Amino acid sequence: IVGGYTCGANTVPYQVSLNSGYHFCGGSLINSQWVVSAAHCYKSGIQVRLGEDNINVVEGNEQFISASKSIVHPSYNSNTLNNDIMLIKLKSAASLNSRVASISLPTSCASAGTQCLISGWGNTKSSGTSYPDVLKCLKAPILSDSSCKSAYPGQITSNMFCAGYLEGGKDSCQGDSGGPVVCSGKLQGIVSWGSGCAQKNKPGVYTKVCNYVSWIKQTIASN
Ligand SMILES: CC(C)C[C@H](NC(=O)[C@@H](O)CC(=O)O)C(=O)NCCCCNC(N)=[NH2+]
Ligand SMILES: [Ca+2]
Ligand SMILES: [Cl-]
Ligand SMILES: [Cl-]
Ligand SMILES: [Cl-]
């Protein structure tokens, strides 16, 4: 997160870190046994880490649980990042508490202007590199589909939306991949891609989760 603030310990209790020896992606806990992340986060040897603030310090609210199954979207295209969504089933159900909580799926798509909370352990610098160990948060508006497609001609699908600031300075970055975009208690977005980070006229592109709610519920009910 570039130009955000320290969330505060366990203030985003639905935020997970995907760990393969190191944090490599964020994700959202949607029930005791299932995480939503990005398809581009896909890999084997995933441990889901819940109740985390400093990912380098054991602070005592952690739950570490192995993925048993990863389901990348049937239509995920890695060339274009269309349908950049993946489900992860835990080997065992998480113990749900004040620090380890599920976030509701959208009943409907959000519109432009809707304010949203974006969170992650990603890069905090728009030039060079700095990785925080504590969860960073950013308040960002959903942008018009028109200004999104103008920012990234030919690259924005109806399965994508832009959020952030065209003036730049505030954005997600690498390490926030697969993480949450929450608007009015609903998970509407997944950190997917962008040209650089917090750059002028290069807003964050997010997977449009409202498009995936039937596939998510159906897949969870069959798995
Ligand atoms: C290519 C896929 C597999 C990974 C993806 N890559 C990118 O976003 C950049 O390489 C694209 C670019 O033009 O710099 C990535 O790192 N995405 C996660 C965070 C994206 C956040 N970027 C924002 N908001 N500017
Ligand atoms: Ca920790
Ligand atoms: Cl509900
Ligand atoms: Cl910072
Ligand atoms: Cl489309």
Side-chain angles (χ1 to χ4, degrees), residues 89-110 112-151:
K89 201 190 193 193
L90 308 194
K91 291 234 343 296
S92 61
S95 182
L96 295 163
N97 54 60
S98 37
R99 319 224 166 81
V100 176
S102 63
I103 185 63
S104 297
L105 295 190
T107 297
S108 69
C109 299
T114 306
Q115 285 298 331
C116 297
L117 180 66
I118 312 178
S119 49
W121 287 277
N123 192 356
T124 63
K125 287 296 179 65
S126 88
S127 311
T129 311
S130 188
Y131 284 97
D133 305 324
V134 296
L135 193 60
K136 303 313 272 218
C137 281
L138 168 64
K139 292 175 210 90
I142 299 184
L143 297 176
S144 60
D145 287 320
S146 64
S147 64
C148 190
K149 293 192 188 77
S150 296

Side-chain angles (χ1 to χ4, degrees), residues 118 138-143 162-168 170-171 203-204 206:
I118 312 178
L138 168 64
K139 292 175 210 90
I142 299 184
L143 297 176
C162 287
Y165 303 88
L166 290 194
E167 61 257 44
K170 292 192 275 187
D171 204 357
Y206 299 88

Side-chain angles (χ1 to χ4, degrees), residues 203-222:
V205 187
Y206 299 88
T207 306
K208 193 163 170 176
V209 164
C210 55
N211 289 7
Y212 294 108
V213 168
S214 323
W215 170 79
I216 292 166
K217 296 156 89 99
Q218 195 269 115
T219 306
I220 286 169
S222 307

